Write an enzyme that holds these catalytic residues in place. Structure first.
Site, short mmCIF file in Angstrom:
data_model
loop_
_atom_site.label_atom_id
_atom_site.label_comp_id
_atom_site.label_asym_id
_atom_site.label_seq_id
_atom_site.Cartn_x
_atom_site.Cartn_y
_atom_site.Cartn_z
N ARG A 1 19.95 9.34 -0.47
CA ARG A 1 18.69 10.04 -0.78
C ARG A 1 18.40 11.24 0.13
O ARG A 1 17.47 12.00 -0.14
CB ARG A 1 17.52 9.05 -0.77
CG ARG A 1 17.50 8.09 -1.96
CD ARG A 1 16.26 7.21 -1.96
NE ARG A 1 16.20 6.31 -3.12
CZ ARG A 1 15.15 5.54 -3.43
NH1 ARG A 1 14.05 5.52 -2.68
NH2 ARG A 1 15.20 4.76 -4.51
N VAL B 1 7.34 7.33 18.05
CA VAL B 1 6.46 8.49 18.27
C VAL B 1 5.46 8.12 19.34
O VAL B 1 4.63 7.24 19.12
CB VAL B 1 5.66 8.92 17.01
CG1 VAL B 1 4.67 10.03 17.36
CG2 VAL B 1 6.61 9.37 15.91
N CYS C 1 5.63 -9.25 4.35
CA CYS C 1 5.13 -10.29 3.45
C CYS C 1 6.05 -11.51 3.30
O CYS C 1 5.57 -12.61 2.97
CB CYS C 1 4.83 -9.72 2.05
SG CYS C 1 4.03 -8.11 2.08
N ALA D 1 0.31 -4.38 0.26
CA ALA D 1 1.58 -3.72 -0.02
C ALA D 1 1.62 -2.85 -1.29
O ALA D 1 2.18 -1.76 -1.25
CB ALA D 1 2.72 -4.74 -0.09
C1 FAD Z 1 2.57 -12.23 7.53
C2 FAD Z 1 2.20 -11.17 6.52
C3 FAD Z 1 2.02 -11.53 5.19
C4 FAD Z 1 1.69 -10.58 4.24
N1 FAD Z 1 1.54 -11.00 2.97
C5 FAD Z 1 1.20 -10.17 1.99
C6 FAD Z 1 1.03 -10.66 0.60
O1 FAD Z 1 1.20 -11.88 0.32
N2 FAD Z 1 0.70 -9.77 -0.35
C7 FAD Z 1 0.52 -8.46 -0.07
O2 FAD Z 1 0.21 -7.68 -1.00
N3 FAD Z 1 0.66 -7.94 1.19
C8 FAD Z 1 0.98 -8.71 2.25
N4 FAD Z 1 1.15 -8.19 3.57
C9 FAD Z 1 0.93 -6.74 3.82
C10 FAD Z 1 2.16 -5.83 3.64
O3 FAD Z 1 3.29 -6.36 4.36
C11 FAD Z 1 1.88 -4.38 4.10
O4 FAD Z 1 0.73 -3.93 3.38
C12 FAD Z 1 2.97 -3.31 3.91
O5 FAD Z 1 4.15 -3.67 4.63
C13 FAD Z 1 2.46 -1.93 4.40
O6 FAD Z 1 3.49 -1.01 4.77
P1 FAD Z 1 3.19 0.14 5.87
O7 FAD Z 1 4.39 1.03 6.02
O8 FAD Z 1 1.88 0.80 5.54
O9 FAD Z 1 2.94 -0.70 7.22
P2 FAD Z 1 3.97 -1.77 7.83
O10 FAD Z 1 4.73 -2.48 6.73
O11 FAD Z 1 3.23 -2.54 8.91
O12 FAD Z 1 5.07 -0.82 8.51
C14 FAD Z 1 4.67 0.19 9.43
C15 FAD Z 1 5.87 0.55 10.30
O13 FAD Z 1 5.53 1.61 11.19
C16 FAD Z 1 6.22 1.39 12.42
N5 FAD Z 1 5.58 2.05 13.57
C17 FAD Z 1 4.42 1.71 14.16
N6 FAD Z 1 4.14 2.54 15.20
C18 FAD Z 1 5.14 3.44 15.28
C19 FAD Z 1 5.47 4.59 16.15
N7 FAD Z 1 4.66 4.97 17.16
N8 FAD Z 1 6.62 5.26 15.89
C20 FAD Z 1 7.45 4.91 14.89
N9 FAD Z 1 7.21 3.87 14.06
C21 FAD Z 1 6.09 3.11 14.20
C22 FAD Z 1 6.31 -0.13 12.58
O14 FAD Z 1 7.46 -0.52 13.34
C23 FAD Z 1 6.35 -0.63 11.15
O15 FAD Z 1 7.66 -1.06 10.76
C24 FAD Z 1 1.50 -9.13 4.60
C25 FAD Z 1 1.68 -8.78 5.95
C26 FAD Z 1 2.02 -9.73 6.91
C27 FAD Z 1 2.21 -9.30 8.34
C1 COA Z 2 11.72 1.05 -2.63
C2 COA Z 2 10.84 1.95 -1.77
C3 COA Z 2 11.71 2.55 -0.68
C4 COA Z 2 10.23 3.09 -2.59
O1 COA Z 2 11.23 3.85 -3.24
P1 COA Z 2 10.89 4.50 -4.66
O2 COA Z 2 11.99 5.47 -5.02
O3 COA Z 2 9.45 4.97 -4.62
O4 COA Z 2 10.99 3.22 -5.64
P2 COA Z 2 12.36 2.74 -6.36
O5 COA Z 2 13.48 2.79 -5.35
O6 COA Z 2 12.04 1.44 -7.07
O7 COA Z 2 12.58 3.90 -7.47
C5 COA Z 2 13.83 4.54 -7.77
C6 COA Z 2 13.79 5.31 -9.10
O8 COA Z 2 14.54 4.59 -10.09
C7 COA Z 2 13.68 3.98 -11.06
N1 COA Z 2 13.89 2.51 -11.14
C8 COA Z 2 13.75 1.67 -10.09
N2 COA Z 2 13.99 0.39 -10.45
C9 COA Z 2 14.29 0.38 -11.76
C10 COA Z 2 14.66 -0.66 -12.76
N3 COA Z 2 14.73 -1.96 -12.38
N4 COA Z 2 14.91 -0.25 -14.03
C11 COA Z 2 14.83 1.05 -14.40
N5 COA Z 2 14.50 2.04 -13.53
C12 COA Z 2 14.23 1.78 -12.22
C13 COA Z 2 12.25 4.29 -10.61
O9 COA Z 2 11.41 4.55 -11.73
C14 COA Z 2 12.38 5.48 -9.68
O10 COA Z 2 12.15 6.67 -10.43
P3 COA Z 2 12.04 8.15 -9.81
O11 COA Z 2 13.49 8.53 -9.88
O12 COA Z 2 11.11 8.92 -10.73
O13 COA Z 2 11.53 8.01 -8.40
C15 COA Z 2 9.61 1.21 -1.21
O14 COA Z 2 8.94 0.50 -2.26
C16 COA Z 2 9.92 0.23 -0.14
O15 COA Z 2 9.86 0.57 1.03
N6 COA Z 2 10.24 -1.00 -0.54
C17 COA Z 2 10.55 -2.04 0.41
C18 COA Z 2 9.28 -2.58 1.07
C19 COA Z 2 8.79 -3.79 0.27
O16 COA Z 2 9.26 -4.01 -0.93
N7 COA Z 2 7.76 -4.51 0.74
C20 COA Z 2 6.78 -3.88 1.62
C21 COA Z 2 5.74 -4.84 2.16
S1 COA Z 2 5.93 -6.49 1.44
#
Ligand code: FAD
Ligand code: COA
Ligand code: FAD
Ligand code: COA
Lengths: 443, 442
Positions: free
Chosen positions: B71, B81, B44, B295
């Site tokens: 962790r 995979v 994102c 996300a």
């Molecule tokens: C440009 C862009 C903008 C976005 N903006 C927004 C936004 O504004 N608001 C919002 O809510 N959401 C947004 N999203 C969506 C959000 O980023 C995803 O919903 C979120 O990251 C989902 O996580 P995921 O693990 O399901 O999939 P992903 O984040 O895509 O991660 C999946 C992972 O699996 C891995 N993988 C794939 N195949 C294999 C394999 N065979 N073996 C091992 N690993 C593998 C990949 O490398 C990847 O890192 C956006 C996405 C993009 C691309």
């Molecule tokens: C963070 C992530 C690894 C999930 O981990 P998670 O353990 O489910 O979430 P957190 O690390 O926030 O939680 C840690 C613990 O501390 C607590 N905690 C976290 N932040 C806190 C805060 N600011 N204040 C007080 N407590 C907090 C939570 O309640 C949680 O409780 P639990 O012990 O019952 O699990 C996952 O959200 C991730 O992959 N994040 C990065 C990806 C991203 O943000 N974007 C993806 C696409 S845009």
């Protein structure tokens, strides 16, 4: 056929109700009597007109002619209702003093500040901030006389908003507070402390101090308390407000336990065909079901709308309030919805709480700021009883939490709510959702 | 006793689920295989790293060591995979097999590849994972890029357009549709973003890209209408779920194209779960199955899957389709059903479209905000809300709560929403919308 409807007061509540009635019954004779020259006005904006953010005429929503000509409401300005009895109202206008009949009556008559009985409150330069004429008076005083030190009495939200309005103009501002902290009536400590660290830096904050006297020549020069003395050429009175019930009592209108006028869901009083709406009116709490007084503007508007509807034979129920409220000192936003830890305990709930800090953005979008949340939860239902929020970007949390409380959400219900995420808006885990997770629902 | 859990993908969903499982069952062996070097990453944020608002390492939350050391998750990076069968997974140098007792597909979705010639020129990019952001940055440092062309009018296209326009580049948008975001929003909403977009981007509507031309590098884009000078191309013509491994296991694929799941995020195959952008879920209003690769849902699904794998039953109710984005100072978002979606679902609908302000006229800085509402005539329930302008987040998030609970127009009207002059006008725009509808009775 046609009825005479009479409405006392031209604030939010009065106009809401007049508009609504006339809207439903164009053939009805809808009269409003407003003591001032101001109609459809916002006392909420007085601090910001005083601060100088706005000219004083902007305090009026529309033109009185909009109500009279365009909406057909017989609006009387500079008209004080002085007596009231069953079927009659006595009013003073041109000077002149004349009686009008009514078939339905609304008390939309607001609340005015408590007058603390210390000597010299009537010096020139001592002000209360309740209606727009107060803003004009404060402005003209500062133009006529050089005001440099300002003293605010009271730590409520009005005190705080007024303090900001003077600090922003470079003035030396001193706050006298009876309590151990500001806003102590309406928020818990760990929340108010965050606003205080900020407030303390731009205002001389004097906690646990009782003002004994206002001293001065032809008008105010100093404030004396049980602790020290404070140079002051302007004093801002804001030590709580009380409902204007004196006319109601004349009609034998039931007064609620809160001090405000008792109503039910249809905004009816104890007297048939008599309604009450706005800051004068006591209402219902959505969570506790207890009767409570929360003199705020959105509720006031809705009450006016509700009263009008029922007067015009279109049944409608006001469910009550959550006590939702927000304000700000400088860059520090503060607000709540539902019950504080204190209130919930007072109501006999078995409660658990949580207090967390989070950020308003993810670490990869810049400008992320600190935000703190307190949650209060009933242990027997997992329902949210209330939320308090301080820092920045608090409005979406408060408004969202408010919806949740309206519906009785649990901690789990909140957790799984589909809240919005994009990097420019918020972090991946919304702070409200983090709060919900903290508590963790179970049994 | 102890089980082996295996998770495919280290995005939001994968890590959510791994954390959650290990949290509930410390004695279990929880392995994650992520193809890239990036874990706990945010695709994102790619537009804003590309725009230059952020350094690329900020796309990762906590170090991989937090997951491994702190962790206790056996995280394998640079691990693809390649094969999957019942009880086994095959992973790659080196190629080795691992057993599993529970499996999660957290495997995301990758961009659709439009089959026009020259998509593989140097300078043609897709924006899906963090390595893409690095590639785009290094290209622009090595070669002088001045004209950029974006293919697609989805939200990715728009966010990418902003990221290049903000850097002074000449940006051209090619859109097949009659308007941008036409799949997800109604016209009277998207038009407001378009008036803005049109001014900072050469917006080309109703145009099909035929070819990308160049020597070793991209130099031009040809469409059914004209040609467009271009030294960098972004492809953002939609995404599709990564289901090829699932199919190997005979995992049920939903009508949407994504992996079918139920409330516990279980697939058609026992002890196999799916979570995130790969997963099809449920709609909270319609009950229909639907795919919304976002996300927050992805995170929650991961959490839910983990809980159930670890014997703590938990249900995901589904989504509302809530989403928000922005082009420059123009905020755009929705929650629940558009007018189009509601009509498609057979609802008897009424709508409203209103303009309001974000402040009262006596506090300055008030800006314009527009709201569309969709309501089921037979229940007075809100089916959806769309919002554009400024300060949209409190309306969207609040509306979302309301939809979760099935609020009516009257329920919304009487909700105790907040008012102070610095925050909003006396009548919140959401409340004005609700009033506009008017609760009707038979
Ligand atoms: C440009 C862009 C903008 C976005 N903006 C927004 C936004 O504004 N608001 C919002 O809510 N959401 C947004 N999203 C969506 C959000 O980023 C995803 O919903 C979120 O990251 C989902 O996580 P995921 O693990 O399901 O999939 P992903 O984040 O895509 O991660 C999946 C992972 O699996 C891995 N993988 C794939 N195949 C294999 C394999 N065979 N073996 C091992 N690993 C593998 C990949 O490398 C990847 O890192 C956006 C996405 C993009 C691309
Ligand atoms: C963070 C992530 C690894 C999930 O981990 P998670 O353990 O489910 O979430 P957190 O690390 O926030 O939680 C840690 C613990 O501390 C607590 N905690 C976290 N932040 C806190 C805060 N600011 N204040 C007080 N407590 C907090 C939570 O309640 C949680 O409780 P639990 O012990 O019952 O699990 C996952 O959200 C991730 O992959 N994040 C990065 C990806 C991203 O943000 N974007 C993806 C696409 S845009
Ligand atoms: C400084 C300040 C800040 C505030 N800030 C906020 C905020 O941030 N958020 C918020 O939600 N609320 C706020 N409020 C509360 C809000 O202003 C009121 O709740 C709202 O105006 C209620 O309208 P009303 O008609 O019930 O009473 P009011 O608006 O108080 O007006 C009542 C009117 O009745 C008239 N009247 C009284 N007696 C008579 C009589 N005998 N005859 C004829 N007319 C009479 C008065 O002249 C008065 O104009 C604030 C109030 C103040 C004073
Ligand atoms: C404005 C007022 C007098 C109440 O009367 P009201 O007519 O019920 O309020 P509005 O002017 O918003 O409503 C007018 C009508 O136009 C409608 N409307 C149409 N388009 C609209 C739009 N774009 N935005 C807002 N309302 C719209 C409203 O829904 C309403 O519908 P109705 O005809 O079914 O009643 C009252 O709110 C007031 O006094 N406001 C100013 C003072 C104030 O509230 N301050 C309080 C303390 S800060």
């Amino acid at each position: 056929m046609k009825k005479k409807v009479v409405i006392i007061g031209g604030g939010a509540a009065g106009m809401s109700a007049a508009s609504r009635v006339k809207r439903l019954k164009p053939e009805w004779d809808v009269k409003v009597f407003e003591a001032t020259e101001w109609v459809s006005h916002a006392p909420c904006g007085i601090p910001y007109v005083v601060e100088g953010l706005s000219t004083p005429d902007k305090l009026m929503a529309a033109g009185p002619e909009v109500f009279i000509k365009k909406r057909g409401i017989d609006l009387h300005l500079n008209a004080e209702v002085i007596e009231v009895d069953t079927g009659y109202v006595r009013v003073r206008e041109n000077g002149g003093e004349k009686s009008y009949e009514w078939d339905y009556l609304v008390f939309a008559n607001g609340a005015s500040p408590q007058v603390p009985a210390i000597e010299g409150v009537n010096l020139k330069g001592v002000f209360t901030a309740d209606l727009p004429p107060d803003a004009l008076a404060i402005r003209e005083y500062m133009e006529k006389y050089k005001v440099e030190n300002v003293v605010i009495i009271g730590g409520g939200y009005i005190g705080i908003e007024m303090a900001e309005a003077f600090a922003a103009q470079g003035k030396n501002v001193t706050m006298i507070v009876r309590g151990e902290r500001v806003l102590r009536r309406s928020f818990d400590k760990e929340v108010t402390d965050i606003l205080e660290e900020k407030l303390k830096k731009h205002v001389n904050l004097r906690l646990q101090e009782i003002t004994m006297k206002i001293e001065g020549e032809e008008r105010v020069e100093k404030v004396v308390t049980d602790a020290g003395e404070y140079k002051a050429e302007l004093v801002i009175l804001a030590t709580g407000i009380k409902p204007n019930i004196e006319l109601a009592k004349q009609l034998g209108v039931r007064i609620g336990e809160t001090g405000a006028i008792w109503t039910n869901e249809k905004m009816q009083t104890s007297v048939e065909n008599v309604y009450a709406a706005g800051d004068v009116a006591e209402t219902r709490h959505v969570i506790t079901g207890r009767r409570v007084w929360v003199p705020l503007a959105p509720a006031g508007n809705k009450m006016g709308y509700v009263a009008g509807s029922n007067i015009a034979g279109k049944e409608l129920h006001f469910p009550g309030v959550l006590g939702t409220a927000v304000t700000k000192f400088m860059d520090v936003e503060i607000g709540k919805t539902g019950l504080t830890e204190m209130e919930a305990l007072k109501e006999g709930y078995d409660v658990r709480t949580a207090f967390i800090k989070a950020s308003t953005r993810p670490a990869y979008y810049p400008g992320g700021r600190e935000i703190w949340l307190k949650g209060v939860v009933d242990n027997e239902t997992n329902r949210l009883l209330g939320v308090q929020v301080v820092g920045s970007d608090i409005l979406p949390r408060i408004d969202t939490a408010a919806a949740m409380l309206m519906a009785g959400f649990t901690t789990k219900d909140a957790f799984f709510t589909d809240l919005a995420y994009a990097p420019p808006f918020a972090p991946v885990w919304d702070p409200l959702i983090v709060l919900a997770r903290v508590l963790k629902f179970l049994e």
